[PDB]
Design a protein around this ligand. Structure first.
Ligand SMILES: Nc1ncnc2c1ncn2[C@@H]1O[C@H](CSCC[C@H](N)C(=O)O)[C@@H](O)[C@H]1O
Lengths: 326, 205
């Protein structure tokens, strides 16, 4: 079982109260959505997900609360149109809970293809066939050139060995099609000496497969999570009430940066991890930020309790960024 | 060029040659004795000594010329000058004796003043800074201001907004608008100036 990550913080943060309408742009399993419909019995809630399996769960769970929860299906970009059909263009949503990442059910079910450990079709697509033409991870690896595929790994996977892990994929695909998760994992391992398979470690300091950065990289290029995250936040702002509390959850750095640089106005094209020294050097050259539209409830990113991390290691990297619209 | 660097451009000016010798300075006397030893390029077909020669209108005609069709370009020019003159003779006969004094009927005076009202004093340059583009204001040389006035006027008349209107009617209408400090081309001048004022703090780049 997967407990909703930081459910206690997200509930306190949004303080759901009677007379307030809320949105959920990532229903998924619905653990967070259900934790929010428990504290306040008079709450109004809206749900959304990219997975039709997740949208069916919400529809089945809608029986528990007939109108307090309203289920919707679609991507972040398509969310505004879907909600615009309802007619809530101003929205006046008190809070938008934009949980991020892959659902526990999505990656616990081997058929969905998200787990390298198990053997499933190399789908790695949050979409559940709602768009049967949407390329899957298998398609991405078999088509793109080394330079193109290396960029996917480098930019989205934070993978130093992008050229080494991409060349192995290019050679492997020629010999046979890459259609299964384990088939890819073995190819990526084959780019390195056999001992490399578990040399790398996580921040938890527990050995991880040497292809855990290629499964994350493709997952984010197949589902365009990063570009869809920028529109998703923007749409929330337009549909978010003034004085309404937004709450995001970033499990990896790339998504965390966008949430940080969006709630603070920082340009998305600035250099990453800028030090104070570099900031001085940057502006010294020019010598020769706009008003913020948010009020961060908690100034610094929250993180899961160390005890809770061991119980749910999947959510160890959950960085909660809360803000109030201005 | 088929002219060697030794070839000098011809000076087509009747007055310059009839000027008496006594009025000449010792510097101007040297220039005249020097040119007698220099090679001179053949006069181009464009410019002559005619009293009706106008270098500004000849330049505007070339900026309107498409594919070397000078006959058509010049036809449009003279049709515009005739259309401007007829519009002013119509405004003149319909006016009172007092207003008639303020009505200009010379199309060359209107053409020149119409362009001078469109010349932008200051312009902007698209500059790159830190992977980001920001425009920078800069003074404009005299050549550039005159060229931009003629390019904005010709561009406006070629705009697709005008539906089935012939060029001599479009250009004549725009020239008379600019002659009165009104029109789209005058707005383009004002917008460029107003933008060059909002980027004054970027003048140090
Ligand atoms: N661009 C996008 N638009 C909509 N839903 C998206 C999305 N990217 C990811 N999702 C979905 O959002 C969820 C995030 S992970 C699951 C979190 C959820 N609160 C839970 O009950 O556990 C997944 O269901 C995922 O498929």
């Amino acid at each position: 079982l997967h407990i909703p990550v930081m459910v206690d913080e997200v509930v306190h943060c949004l303080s759901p109260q009677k007379g307030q309408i809320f949105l959920d742009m990532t229903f998924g399993s619905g653990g967070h959505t259900k934790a929010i419909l428990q504290k306040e019995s008079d709450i109004v809630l809206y749900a959304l997900d990219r997975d039709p399996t997740a949208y069916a769960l919400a529809e089945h769970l809608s029986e528990l609360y007939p109108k307090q929860i309203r289920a919707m299906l679609g991507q972040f970009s398509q969310a505004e149109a879907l909600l615009m059909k309802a007619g809530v263009q101003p929205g006046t949503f008190d809070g938008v809970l934009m949980d991020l990442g892959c659902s526990s059910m999505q990656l616990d079910t081997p058929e969905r293809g998200f787990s390298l450990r198990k053997d499933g079709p190399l789908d790695m697509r949050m979409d559940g066939g709602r768009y049967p033409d949407m390329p899957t991870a298998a398609d991405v690896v078999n088509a793109l050139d080394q330079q193109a595929l290396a960029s996917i790994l480098r930019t989205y996977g934070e993978e130093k060995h992008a050229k080494k892990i991409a060349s192995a994929i290019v050679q492997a695909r020629s010999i046979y099609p890459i259609t299964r998760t384990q088939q890819l994992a073995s190819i990526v391992a084959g780019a390195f000496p056999p001992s490399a398979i578990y040399t790398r470690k996580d921040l938890l300091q527990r050995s991880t497969h040497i292809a855990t950065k290629t499964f994350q990289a493709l997952r984010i290029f197949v589902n365009n999570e990063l570009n869809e995250l920028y529109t998703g936040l923007k749409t929330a702002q337009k549909f978010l009430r003034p004085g309404g509390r937004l709450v995001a959850l970033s499990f990896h750095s790339l998504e965390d940066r966008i949430v940080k640089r969006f709630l603070l106005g920082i340009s998305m094209t600035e250099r990453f991890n800028l030090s104070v020294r570099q900031q001085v050097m940057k502006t010294s050259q020019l010598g020769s930020r706009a008003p913020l539209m948010w009020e961060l409830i908690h100034k610094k990113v929250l993180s899961p309790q160390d005890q809770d991390v061991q119980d749910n290691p999947r959510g160890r990297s959950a960085k909660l960024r809360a803000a109030i619209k201005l | 060029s088929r002219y060697s660097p030794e070839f000098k451009d011809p000076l087509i000016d009747k007055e310059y040659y009839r000027k008496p010798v006594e009025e000449l300075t010792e510097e101007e006397k040297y220039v005249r004795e020097l040119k007698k030893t220099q090679l001179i390029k053949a006069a181009p077909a464009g410019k002559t000594s005619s009293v009706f020669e106008d270098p500004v209108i000849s330049k505007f005609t070339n900026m309107m010329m498409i594919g070397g069709n000078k006959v058509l370009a010049r036809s449009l020019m003279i049709q515009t000058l005739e259309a401007v003159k007829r519009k002013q003779f119509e405004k003149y006969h319909a006016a009172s004796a007092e207003e008639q004094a303020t009505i200009e009927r010379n199309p060359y005076t209107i053409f020149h003043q119409a362009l001078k009202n469109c010349e932008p004093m200051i312009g902007l340059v698209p500059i790159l800074k830190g992977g980001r583009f920001y425009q920078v204001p800069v003074p404009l040389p005299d050549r550039r201001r005159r060229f931009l006035a003629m390019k904005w006027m010709i561009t406006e008349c070629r705009d697709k907004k005008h539906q089935r209107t012939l060029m001599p009617e479009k250009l004549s209408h725009k020239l008379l608008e600019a002659f009165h400090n009104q029109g789209p081309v005058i707005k383009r001048k004002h917008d460029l100036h107003k933008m060059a004022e909002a980027n004054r703090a970027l003048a140090h780049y």
